[PDB]
Amino acid sequence: EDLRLHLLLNTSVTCNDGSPAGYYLKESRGSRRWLLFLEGGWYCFNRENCDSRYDTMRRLMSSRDWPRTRTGTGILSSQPEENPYWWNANMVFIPYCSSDVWSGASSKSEKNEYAFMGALIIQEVVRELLGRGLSGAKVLLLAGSSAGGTGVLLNVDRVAEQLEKLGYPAIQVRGLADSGWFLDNKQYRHTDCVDCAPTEAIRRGIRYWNGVVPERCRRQFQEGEEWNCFFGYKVYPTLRSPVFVVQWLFDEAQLTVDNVHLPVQEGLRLYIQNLGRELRHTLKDVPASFAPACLSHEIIIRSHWTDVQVKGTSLPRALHCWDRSLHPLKGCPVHLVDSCPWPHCNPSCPT
Ligand SMILES: *[C@@H]1O[C@H](CO)[C@@H](O)[C@H](O)[C@H]1NC(C)=O
Ligand SMILES: Cn1c(=O)c2[nH]cnc2n(C)c1=O
């Protein structure tokens, strides 16, 4: 069950190197549900580090070598055995080729070696899909993993505003942010970084990308402080669209930026326990959430995404309960946050 590539008809909406951006689509003619998924993969923030990414991560900067098809997996699968939640939906995979956490609005020019158009790519995909059946939708779920999950938080309200302005007020826009809820915490060991702390890298990135953030969050933090809006616990309270948050309590990318690697002594034990407690605290007032006590980099487009449970409930079940809640529910919970304090204290964590 493959998704087919469509390069954007507006060829001025581009990947980093000026090649056209695009999307992979599998239609389901009997369905009014649409799932648009944002791929992740870090980011780059100056000429030197973007040049290095162009040599060895070129598919994340260019469409020139993309394949004609991709197979949908996990939440993008059309088989009910693999995807109990939304197997009959129209499926869209949007490749990440802008290196800007889906925030950019800047074209290649005599002054710019690369284009950073992530925010405009999402806009243009939505516009072109309206002529291919999206005009008839009841629900548009904007989902994403890692940098794509942060991209959901930055873009879900702009998609909702775009559809209203275009004359489609009956489409309900919602977000699903997987593995994109980060903390601007103190590192376990400091000055290490690479290239550098995410706060400083993002501050530089916004200027290099001409990056944009949601309007209410922008108005709170004001000029020069837009980097704050890349942090889930700060941007989420400003959003109007419903958003479901999936986040490992001990996410591997969070630990990497914190300079933690892997016989654990007291200082590191306390650091790890405090990180899980802080993450749990930030989710206390997030009513739709799934946060297992695991050390993982695994994401929701993996084939075995159904296996993990919190308090005896899987993620596909929690998402179904969220759908019902948007029509508490007896035996159908939507707020699922582990309370145990060490990775793999939940026996269902990925192996
Ligand atoms: C293509 O997209 C750009 C960026 O959003 C926009 O300014 C331009 O008007 C579009 N071109 C056409 C022909 O729609
Ligand atoms: C690793 N990482 C982060 O640490 C971070 N912090 C804020 N956004 C972030 N993003 C998008 C990210 O990829």
Report CA 26 to chain centroid distance, whole Å.
20
- Phi and psi angles of residue 296, each rounded to the nearest 5 degrees, phi first: -155, 155
Q: Residue 226 Cα, ligand 2 centroid: separation in angstroms?
A: 14
The residues with which 141 forms a beta bridge, in sequence order, are 35, 174
| Of 346, 218, 221, nearest in space to 291 by CA | 346
Question: Structure tokens of 202?
Answer: 């993002």
Question: Structure tokens of 341?
Answer: 């304090």
Q: C-alpha dihedral over 123, 67, 44, 289, to 10 degrees?
A: 60
| Of 57, 75, 74, 59, nearest in space to 22 by CA | 59
Q: Give the helix/strand (H/E) hosting 141.
A: strand 139-145
According to DSSP, residue 3 is labeled E
Q: State which of 39, 101, 206, 226 you would mutate to test the pocket of ligand 2, scoring each by most atoms of that ligand within 8 A of its C-beta.
A: 101
Q: What atom of ligand 2 comes closest to residue 147's alpha carbon?
A: 11
| Ligand lying closest to the C-alpha of residue 152 | 2
**Rounded Cα gap, residues 134 and 205, in angstroms:** 33
Task: Determine which residue's CA is closest to atom 8 belonging to ligand 2.
Answer: 230
Expressed in percent and rounded to 5, the helix, strand and coil fractions of the chain are: 35, 20, 50
| Of 104, 107, 195, 180, nearest in space to 149 by CA | 180
- Distances in Å between the Cα of 61 and the Cα atoms of 24, 57, 109, 119, 291 are 17, 7, 16, 15, 31
Angle at 102 (CA atoms; ends 250, 192), nearest 5 degrees: 45
The answer to whether the beta carbons of residues 241 and 156 sit under 8 Å apart is: yes
Question: Structure tokens of 294?
Answer: 């695991």
Q: What atom of ligand 1 comes closest to residue 13's alpha carbon?
A: 2
The answer to whether the beta carbons of residues 288 and 315 sit under 8 Å apart is: no
Domain count, the chain: 1
Active site residues: 146, 251, 297
| Of 38, 82, 33, 41, nearest in space to 61 by CA | 41
**Rounded Cα gap, residues 7 and 22, in angstroms:** 4
3-state secondary structure of 296: strand
Report CA 89 to chain centroid distance, whole Å.
19
Question: Structure tokens of 271?
Answer: 């650091």
The answer to whether the beta carbons of residues 181 and 288 sit under 8 Å apart is: no
The answer to whether the beta carbons of residues 205 and 211 sit under 8 Å apart is: yes
Q: Give the helix/strand (H/E) hosting 291.
A: strand 289-291
3-state secondary structure of 2: strand
| Ligand lying closest to the C-alpha of residue 153 | 2
Q: Residue 345 Cα, ligand 1 centroid: separation in angstroms?
A: 51
**Rounded Cα gap, residues 110 and 114, in angstroms:** 10
Count of CB atoms within 10 A of residue 339's CB?
13
Q: Residue 329 Cα, ligand 2 centroid: separation in angstroms?
A: 34
DSSP 229-274: GGSHHHHGGG--S-EEEE--TEEHHHHHHTT------HHHHHHHHH
CB of 182 closer than 6 angstroms to any ligand 2 atom: yes
Q: Residue 274 Cα, ligand 1 centroid: separation in angstroms?
A: 47
Q: Residue 56 Cα, ligand 2 centroid: separation in angstroms?
A: 21
Q: Residue 220: which domain range?
A: 1-351
**Rounded Cα gap, residues 306 and 314, in angstroms:** 6
Tell which phi-psi region holds residue 316, choosing left (phi > 0), alpha (psi between -120 and 50) or beta: alpha
Q: How was this structure determined?
A: X-ray
Angle at 147 (CA atoms; ends 146, 149), nearest 5 degrees: 65
- Give Cβ neighbours of residue 174 (< 8 Å, ≥ 6 apart): 139, 140, 141, 142, 156, 241, 242, 243, 244, 326
In which residue are the tokens 């964590």 written? Answer: 349
According to DSSP, residue 112 is labeled B
Task: Determine which residue's CA is closest to atom 7 belonging to ligand 1.
Answer: 12
Type of residue numbered 163: L
- Give Cβ neighbours of residue 132 (< 8 Å, ≥ 6 apart): 25, 27
Sign of CA dihedral 186, 292, 337, 274: negative
3-state secondary structure of 320: helix
Q: State which of 10, 106, 127, 212 you would mutate to test the pocket of ligand 1, scoring each by most atoms of that ligand within 8 A of its C-beta.
A: 10
The answer to whether the beta carbons of residues 108 and 115 sit under 8 Å apart is: yes
Task: Determine which residue's CA is closest to atom 10 belonging to ligand 2.
Answer: 147
3-state secondary structure of 286: coil
Residue 30 burial (C-beta neighbours within 10 Å; 0-12, 13-18, 19+): exposed
Tell which phi-psi region holds residue 236, choosing left (phi > 0), alpha (psi between -120 and 50) or beta: alpha
- Phi and psi angles of residue 315, each rounded to the nearest 5 degrees, phi first: -65, -50
